Design an enzyme around this catalytic site. Structure first.
Site, PDB file in Angstrom:
ATOM      1  N   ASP G   8       0.755  -1.422  -0.169  1.00 46.00           N
ATOM      2  CA  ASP G   8      -0.367  -0.549  -0.274  1.00 46.00           C
ATOM      3  C   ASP G   8       0.504   1.378   0.165  1.00 46.00           C
ATOM      4  O   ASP G   8       0.362   2.406  -0.132  1.00 46.00           O
ATOM      5  CB  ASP G   8      -0.657   0.198   1.324  1.00 46.00           C
ATOM      6  N   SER G  33       2.194   6.925   0.316  1.00 45.34           N
ATOM      7  CA  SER G  33       1.143   6.031   1.455  1.00 45.34           C
ATOM      8  C   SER G  33      -0.330   6.552   0.140  1.00 45.34           C
ATOM      9  O   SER G  33      -1.173   8.265   0.089  1.00 45.34           O
ATOM     10  CB  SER G  33       0.603   6.465   2.295  1.00 45.34           C
ATOM     11  N   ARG G  34      -1.032   5.631  -0.153  1.00 41.84           N
ATOM     12  CA  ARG G  34      -1.994   5.044  -0.259  1.00 41.84           C
ATOM     13  C   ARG G  34      -3.080   5.386   0.016  1.00 41.84           C
ATOM     14  O   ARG G  34      -4.488   5.322  -0.502  1.00 41.84           O
ATOM     15  CB  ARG G  34      -2.330   3.840  -1.763  1.00 41.84           C
ATOM     16  N   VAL G  35      -3.078   5.218   1.456  1.00 46.75           N
ATOM     17  CA  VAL G  35      -4.623   5.703   2.596  1.00 46.75           C
ATOM     18  C   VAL G  35      -4.565   7.041   2.263  1.00 46.75           C
ATOM     19  O   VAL G  35      -5.191   7.637   2.628  1.00 46.75           O
ATOM     20  CB  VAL G  35      -4.270   4.806   3.465  1.00 46.75           C
TER      21      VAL G  35
END
Ligand SMILES: Nc1ncnc2c1ncn2[C@@H]1O[C@H](COP(=O)(O)OP(=O)(O)OP(=O)(O)O)[C@@H](O)[C@H]1O
Ligand SMILES: [Mg+2]
Lengths: 340, 230, 284, 52, 52, 115, 86
Positions: G8, G33-35
């Site tokens: 992620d 950070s994909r979150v």
């Protein structure tokens, strides 16, 4: 995406009225692309003169591999009968991939890029069938039906390099097998100079014996003018107030470069090409060295068609050149400058 | 033909194709590859050819071999194996041909490992080194001249540029096989005749002839006949 | 390593070497124009300074502030510089030589007033901390006396209002097409160090009406003519230094190209042998 | 000197007027060619499409 | 007066040539219209003949 | 293709690509030899290149969570009109950030006013 | 390549930054950070959005303007601010 197909099919379209029959072999192309091409071939001219051989990406590797040899057998029919023909092989790299698949599934020992050992002997024996053949052969093949003809089969293989790597195995094989390449550089195409041929690295090993005479006389200086523009292009980027000899040379280079570009489905007859090159070579552009050159060429072609078409017939017939033609071309250019 | 006692030439149209065909046959036989994919027996298959081409107590075979260097890479095993066998290197140049000098042999990049005094003799060695030095100096002064002007040149450097232009022209020669293009009779210069000609031009005799006296003229004694008419 | 990124660096260094060769073209041609301009300015300025040299020494002396050898409380410098880069160290060497003399006066407690004719001088002396009292920048490919007069007019006012007692110009001499040197030259206070005009000591110089106005005008012209020649000669020096720098940059670019190519060739050979070894091992 | 003022100026009006008209006419020529060929292609492409 | 006569001659041509060119660009626009028109017209002929 | 898109669209696209390609080759030259050794017409085209390369950026409704800004939808016509205006220099005087992360060119002039 | 494809996000730590003394030697613009903003407190979310862009564009300006002795103060301002946050 640099115009390899566009150049080949425009070559085919220009054969509508020559006696040269044409063949397009589509190896591993996707079917909707092939269909779009075939429709363009009928619409912009004649699909009557072309044989289309298809092996789509969904068909088995055996059919892809062999396809080009089947097309050569269809073109080799005309060659041995006494008639000229032109075959285009689209992606010889896809044929090489298909042969690699077949070889590996048959367990045959791998080579440099896993390609089989005889991958040279695949394309070598394919392309060396493209030949011009003497009247004795064509008279002994046909057993005395044609007598003084000489058949031929011109070939234009198409190869795709990856990020312009010219040292890869299949490209270097084919570059050794063939005799001249038309190298299509990508950053010229992105620049809008389409067709994006790159002189100096693109050569023709047959020389000017293939040119007709008027195209030979009017093209010798073009090569030197572009060579001089290659070196003097570096200066053009940032500098000025050079010697007027150089300044003239650079400018003329930049405008001959501007002259050698054209729309996709417009082919140009020898007389039209001739006079446009004459206009560049004799200096009729030297005062017109501005963005109008595209409009200037279109206007010149319309004007020439409107007033002096028997000259265009005589040049399209003969390609001859002499002092009388040189003077007449001067008279035509001198008159056209007075117009728009 | 060697065993009849003649001096033979063997031309090989491309030795790289010999090496590469050796790779193809080795892959078809299935042997494990080495180096940049070349056959395991690369140097042996080269050595078996190249060692038969020799002088002998009867006759000799000389060989002129055309060389292709893959990817321009002088370190690639086929170049690197081949160069161990070559005794001389002749380079043909589009630049020299554009000047109209034929044969279009670059004198600076061409070399021979016979060209050492204990092999070739001192007179020949020092002549050949002299012509190399003069043409190299001229190749530098030409860069200056363009960058500035001939005004910069000293009188000595002008005499260097003049002699170099004469030497460069005197390298050109009319060939018997080239009469149709050139129309000239065609000549065969002896080794002593060329050594004398270049020695004379280097030591400054014939500094009073025009440089067009030397072009396509064969020997130096014909250079003075041409300058006599010119 | 990495074949595509190295081949990208080889492409960029190749094109940079080709540009530095073209810059060496522009630099030589501008040197031609600059040195023939200098050759024209040289006779007039050289004879004007000779003329004042004759006025330095010989009787019927009028008394004038630029003529007498007064004491030194502070010192003036006219500093010429480039406004551009790529001229090697020409400005650095001149600025260091000035900094040495200004240090020698600062040892004596004699202050320095500085007038800058180029942007490099303004940047260096402001950031080092010399008292820049005048400045002009970006004179152009053809410099003209007219723009340069204002800074000089300020330095003249500082002398003639009596604050500034000794005045110099610092500049590079075009000793040869390929050799130059930075110089500090005594300028306005006419050095009695110069040769006495004993060779024509028959003459005690005499005047048309108002020797004060005539002589004041003539010395104004002398100072200006000296500054204009010193600028034109420094521009010829600049073009010579730029051509030498670009020649060095061309040879160093070729030196990198010949070594990056060896890294690339070794990398392609290893890549070609890592594969094949892995295809034969996988074929098993 | 005056006499020439009228004579010399004769060419400017005389020649300019002729050229101006000649180029003006040349346009009506371009228009006639462009629209007569547009008509020809408009009929040729209709007949072609219905035979296809 | 002579110099005035020279200037007006150079003007005349520029107006005349720019006046021919606007006819040429009008003809190009009209051609693009009338060619599209022909294409659609024959298209409708094709649609009916192929459905029938 | 000029046949299937509007010919103004095609001309705008060819212009944009030609300009950005011309920037790319200048990049390493400026990096080593410096911006002062460009010419004025290159200093112009390097500026217009930067303005074009900012006006390609855009806020998305689905990329709002990452950046804290509303999302923008531009109609095709507005896109052509903007890039043609930038290349024709009608907005040459605006700073680069006046084009960054904006919608239509009317929003480029509104944000330019706020700037 | 496999693990970069599965995860992620990435934190890239670099030898050059570590030797230069930037420790922790995180390279922004190569790490993501994909979150992203969802995994932050609202204060951090608010303050951190400006930082992420500012450092990435600062390294671009710092490369592009190595040699220009004088500069536009808009650019100059950014350059200083980037050195401050670094
Ligand atoms: N002379 C030209 N003028 C304008 N556009 C052109 C020209 N020639 C080709 N193009 C365009 O370039 C694009 C790529 O052409 P083409 O498909 O022939 O490239 P390619 O090298 O065959 O690509 P691929 O290898 O993926 O098939 C097409 O959109 C085509 O319309
Ligand atoms: Mg394509």
């Amino acid at each position: 995406q640099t115009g390899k197909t566009a150049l080949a099919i425009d070559a085919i379209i220009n054969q509508r009225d020559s006696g040269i029959k044409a063949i397009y072999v589509a190896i591993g192309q996707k079917a909707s692309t092939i269909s779009n091409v075939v429709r363009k071939l009928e619409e912009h001219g004649a699909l009557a003169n072309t044989i289309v051989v298809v092996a789509t990406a969904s068909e088995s590797a055996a059919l892809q591999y062999l396809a080009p040899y089947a097309g050569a057998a269809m073109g080799e029919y005309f060659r041995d009968r006494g008639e000229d023909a032109l075959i285009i092989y689209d992606d010889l790299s896809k044929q090489a991939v298909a042969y690699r698949q077949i070889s590996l599934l048959l367990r045959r020992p791998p080579g440099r890029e896993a390609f089989p050992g005889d991958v040279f002997y695949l394309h070598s024996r394919l392309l060396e069938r493209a030949a011009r053949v003497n009247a004795e052969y064509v008279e002994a093949f046909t057993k005395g039906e044609v007598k003084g003809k000489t058949g031929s089969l011109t070939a234009l293989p198409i190869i795709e390099t990856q990020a312009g790597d010219v040292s890869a195995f299949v490209p270097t094989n084919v570059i050794s097998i063939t005799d001249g390449q038309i190298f299509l550089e990508t950053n010229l195409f992105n620049a809008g100079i389409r067709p994006a041929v790159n002189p100096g690295i693109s050569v023709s090993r047959v020389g000017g014996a293939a040119q007709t005479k008027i195209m030979k006389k009017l093209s010798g200086g073009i090569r030197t003018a572009l060579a001089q523009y290659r070196e003097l292009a570096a200066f053009s980027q940032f500098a000025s107030d050079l010697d007027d000899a150089t300044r003239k040379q650079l400018d003329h280079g930049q405008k001959v470069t501007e002259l050698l570009k054209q729309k996709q489905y417009a082919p140009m007859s020898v007389a039209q090409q001739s006079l446009v090159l004459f206009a560049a070579e004799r200096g009729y552009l030297a005062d017109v060295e501005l963005s109008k050159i595209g409009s200037f060429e279109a206007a010149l072609l319309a004007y020439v068609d409107r007033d002096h078409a028997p000259l265009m017939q005589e040049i399209n017939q003969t390609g001859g050149y002499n002092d009388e033609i040189e003077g007449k071309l001067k008279g035509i250019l001198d008159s056209f400058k007075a117009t728009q | 033909f060697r065993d009849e006692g003649r001096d033979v030439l063997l031309f090989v149209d491309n030795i790289y194709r010999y090496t590469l065909a050796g790779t193809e046959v080795s892959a078809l036989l299935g042997r494990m590859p080495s180096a940049v994919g070349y056959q395991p027996t690369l140097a042996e298959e080269m050595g078996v050819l190249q060692e038969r081409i020799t002088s002998t107590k009867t006759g000799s075979i000389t060989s002129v071999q055309a060389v292709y260097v893959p990817a321009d890479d002088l370190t690639d095993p086929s170049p690197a194996t081949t160069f161990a066998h070559l005794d001389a290197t002749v380079v043909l140049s589009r630049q020299i041909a554009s000047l109209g000098i034929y044969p279009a042999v670059d004198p600076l990049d061409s070399t021979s490992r016979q060209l050492d005094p204990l092999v070739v003799g001192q007179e020949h060695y020092d002549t050949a080194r002299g012509v190399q030095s003069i043409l190299q100096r001229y190749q530098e002064l030409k860069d200056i001249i363009a960058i500035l002007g001939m005004d910069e040149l000293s009188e000595e450097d002008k005499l260097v540029v003049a002699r170099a232009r004469k030497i460069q022209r005197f390298l050109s020669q009319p060939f018997f096989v080239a009469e149709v293009f050139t129309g000239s009779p065609g000549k065969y210069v002896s080794l002593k005749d060329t050594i004398r000609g270049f020695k004379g031009i280097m030591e400054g005799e014939y500094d009073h002839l025009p440089e067009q006296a030397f072009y396509m003229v064969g020997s130096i004694e014909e250079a003075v006949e041409k300058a006599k008419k010119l | 390593a990495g074949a595509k990124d190295i081949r990208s660096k080889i492409a960029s260094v190749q094109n940079t070497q080709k540009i530095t060769k073209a810059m060496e073209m522009v630099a030589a041609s501008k040197m031609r124009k600059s040195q023939d301009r200098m050759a024209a300015s040289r006779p007039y300025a050289e004879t004007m300074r000779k003329v004042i040299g004759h006025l330095a020494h010989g009787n019927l002396e009028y008394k004038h502030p630029y003529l007498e050898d007064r004491d030194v409380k502070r010192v003036g410098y006219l500093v010429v510089s480039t406004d551009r880069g790529l001229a090697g160290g020409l400005n650095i060497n001149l600025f260091k030589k000035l900094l040495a003399e200004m240090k020698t006066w600062t040892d004596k407690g004699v202050q320095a007033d500085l007038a800058m004719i180029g942007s490099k001088g303004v940047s260096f002396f402001n950031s080092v901390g010399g008292n820049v009292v005048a400045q002009v920048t970006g004179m152009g490919d053809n410099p003209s006396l007219s723009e340069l007069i204002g800074p000089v007019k300020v330095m003249l006012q500082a002398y003639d209002e009596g604050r500034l007692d000794k005045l110099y110009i610092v500049s590079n001499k075009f000793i040869n097409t390929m050799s130059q040197v930075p110089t500090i030259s005594q300028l306005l206070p006419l050095p009695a160090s110069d040769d006495d005009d004993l060779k024509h000591k028959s003459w005690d110089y005499l005047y048309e009406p108002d020797p004060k106005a005539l002589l004041d005008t003539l010395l104004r012209r002398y100072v200006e003519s000296q500054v204009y020649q010193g600028v034109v000669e420094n521009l010829a020096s600049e073009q010579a230094a730029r051509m030498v720098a670009m020649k060095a940059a061309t040879d160093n670019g070729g030196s990198l190209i010949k070594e990056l190519q060896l890294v690339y060739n070794k990398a392609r050979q290893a890549s070609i042998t890592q594969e094949l070894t892995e295809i034969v091992s996988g074929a098993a | 000197d005056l006499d020439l003022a009228k004579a010399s100026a004769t060419d400017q009006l005389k020649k300019a007027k002729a050229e101006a008209q000649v180029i003006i006419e040349q346009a009506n020529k371009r228009r006639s060619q462009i629209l007569d060929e547009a008509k020809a292609e408009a009929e040729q492409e209709r007949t072609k499409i219905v035979a296809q």
